[PDB]
Amino acid sequence: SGCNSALLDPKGQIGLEQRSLILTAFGLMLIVVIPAILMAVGFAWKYRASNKDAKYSPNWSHSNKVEAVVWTVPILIIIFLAVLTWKTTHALEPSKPLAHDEKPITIEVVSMDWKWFFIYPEQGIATVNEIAFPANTPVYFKVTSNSVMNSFFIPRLGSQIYAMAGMQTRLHLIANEPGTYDGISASYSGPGFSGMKFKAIATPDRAAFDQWVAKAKQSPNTMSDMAAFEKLAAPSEYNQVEYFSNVKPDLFADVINKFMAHG
């Protein structure tokens, strides 16, 4: 339709591609679904019992041309939609990096009990429930969980990806337009799932993004080690944006190694 919703009006290249395939699939299915509903109401009304001047062949129960057509048209619509499914599933794979001359910004995403934790490794900072990145720049999300399965989702920008503990998913996104986009967990995770909800800020340029990084380095609190991590990973709800200025250089690997611990 013509909504200003997050999916019918997306602001990222991945979301625009998904909107295009949603509209294409929707129209291809309308080709076969709209005559079905129209013949449902029309065949209901037209061949009434009270309607004397109809044909009424009660013993006609098989044909070859009707049977051939009603097999044929679903076959052809499913062939076209299947070809488009093949091409678009290989094109919009979340683990596949985006074709872009800008080098991506790597953001590390950890689903805490009911909050979103973010690590910028090459910037060496951390945030809760807020990310920023320059617009028109590819963004590489390395996503894992800390407790249970979640689903990292910025609907205006692109796809979901599951956040699972002890294992690393990866997503590639980009924003085609500066702004502030609501992100959520899209997989229920317990009493607090309604609160785990963040903002992604697409700054208009790199200088505004560097200013947001420089604001994060002024934070008194540091994520220096695992003790600060488990202090922050204590369960809580609806937590505000906070920043961390010093980050242990491989914290993401440490969080995943908590669950791949051998001995």
Binding site: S95, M164, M167, Q168, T169, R170, A253, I256
Partner: protein, 99 residues
């Protein structure tokens, strides 16, 4: 009386062979792993068919062919479920490592 004593005893001897040889190939390591592993899976499969033919009296006309069919459909479901579950889980486990 579908089974004779001779049918059961030939199934018995075949089962003894198809059990003792894969065990011997694994306990000694005589071949290399590939032509051990393929051998033990082949001999397991043919021993399963020997047990079905000899001990279950399994045939294409026993209950209007519905035993065989039920079994062929069941083997198709086992094939889809097990092989698909291994394929899905291997692709997932590849895609969860710290690249």
């Amino acid at each position: 009386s579908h089974g004779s004593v001779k049918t059961y005893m030939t199934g018995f001897i075949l089962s003894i062979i198809l059990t003792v040889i894969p065990f011997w190939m694994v306990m000694t390591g005589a071949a290399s792993p590939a032509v051990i592993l393929g051998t033990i899976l082949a001999m397991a499969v043919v021993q399963v068919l020997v047990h079905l033919v000899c001990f279950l009296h399994m045939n294409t006309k026993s209950d209007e062919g519905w035993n065989m069919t039920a079994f062929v459909f069941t083997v198709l479901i086992i094939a889809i479920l097990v092989v698909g579950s291994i394929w899905i889980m291997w692709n997932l486990n590849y895609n969860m490592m710290m690249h």
